[PDB]
Amino acid sequence: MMCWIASYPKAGGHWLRCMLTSYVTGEPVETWPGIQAGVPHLEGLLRDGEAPSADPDEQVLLATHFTADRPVLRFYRESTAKVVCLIRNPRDAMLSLMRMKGIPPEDVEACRKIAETFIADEGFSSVRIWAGEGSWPENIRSWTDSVHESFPNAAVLAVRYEDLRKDPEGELWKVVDFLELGGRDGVADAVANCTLERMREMEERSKLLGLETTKSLKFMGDDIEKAYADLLHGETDFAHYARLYGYA
Amino acid sequence: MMCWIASYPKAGGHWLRCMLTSYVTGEPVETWPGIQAGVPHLEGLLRDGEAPSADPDEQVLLATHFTADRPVLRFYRESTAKVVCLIRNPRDAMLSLMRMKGIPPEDVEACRKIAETFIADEGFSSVRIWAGEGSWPENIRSWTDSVHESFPNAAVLAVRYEDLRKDPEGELWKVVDFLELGGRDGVADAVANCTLERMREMEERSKLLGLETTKSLKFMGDDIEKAYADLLHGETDFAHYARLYGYA
């Protein structure tokens, strides 16, 4: 059966794909593309026209930011067994885009714009970079409560970025355990292999070799703060999920 | 049954997708995304997780630069009925990349590099922009002589960019006819709707609306000319196909 590491953009997908990869190898991650090798990002494979077999006879780990109901995933309708659903504070993802796009904390105009757009979009829908990811809630809902509308044989484990941070080895082991990947000894090591430090290192090595790669809201605030809290406490699905996952 | 407009990159794919679209509508192409609507580029749909049904009961036009044997296309193995295979002078595609990437005819260093790479790659394989397209010959071979290795029920029509230029209405009608799309009256109009002029117009209108978008070898020459002719007359498959399609 087939398994998805599903995550909205910026939720820490690379990080967790890193750990899972190193846990399966038990060997560190020597090279940035090593991550795409271990837990392929679906979008990456489709870009070069790869597309893994529907119903493998042995367990397979894939990752994606697609919402769970994008047509392309329909090929995996019956074979999808399990889904780790990686979630992080929507406030932080928004801040994340900002660092991402360039933009120091100062250029308010720049950032105010992105934040207002984020807010009316309830997530990244207007951002050219990703596609078929939906709004934060759309995406999460799709991989969780309504997961069975796309993958009827599917069990799901939600994991919060924030929880992985507080305690990487406990949380990861929960994912390992869930995925039936093995022991717990591997977990300690695997965690270590993928550290802000390691990841930055592992990253720029490969960049240099010529290889393929990639606070809070006070500043800019007063009213961009007001618009957020107003959305973060509405009757919408964004607010629902922010409440449910302790971003409230 | 299902139909592919297959073309290496730079062979004039947009242009022909334009005409085919306007022939089916009989209405001009009002808007640049109108092209993706009429004859969707496969890669585009996969990027947002669309992916059209294997075996439609009614005829369907798709386009791609993938080589015909990329895994992803395997879903269309039995349903693929027909394949228009758009080809142009490999010399011109190389020149095309150059205009594409920026680069005025002068910056020899810039262009010499790209050309030498093109030559050792026999086409665009090292260029980040496209993926799973193969080298020129790899690609063409895959959609033509070996087409049945991927799509066993498939008939193919090759059409040269150069021929479409010399005579757009005759050549297009050949594609129309082949594809069993209808008359010949439509052809005259359709041709007109998509003209270097029209296409540039249709293009920048949409850019401005905030919409999604996109000689010979003497200069730089003497030796980059020698390297080319040497390849263009080798025992390789590139030279084979250059010979076969009158680029010889």
Ligand SMILES: Nc1ncnc2c1ncn2[C@@H]1O[C@H](COP(=O)(O)O)[C@@H](OP(=O)(O)O)[C@H]1O
């Ligand atoms: N080894 C690691 N440990 C913890 N967090 C990491 C990490 N590697 C990357 N991250 C953070 O995870 C986010 C990447 O998101 P994704 O991989 O889902 O696109 C980034 O958020 P920030 O840029 O806000 O810190 C990144 O900094």
Ligand SMILES: Nc1ncnc2c1ncn2[C@@H]1O[C@H](COP(=O)(O)O)[C@@H](OP(=O)(O)O)[C@H]1O
């Ligand atoms: N309406 C039209 N008629 C003829 N040629 C066109 C056209 N629109 C675009 N082209 C040419 O077709 C090529 C586009 O390639 P593709 O669409 O396969 O990527 C470009 O080659 P040049 O840039 O060398 O002229 C482009 O200029």
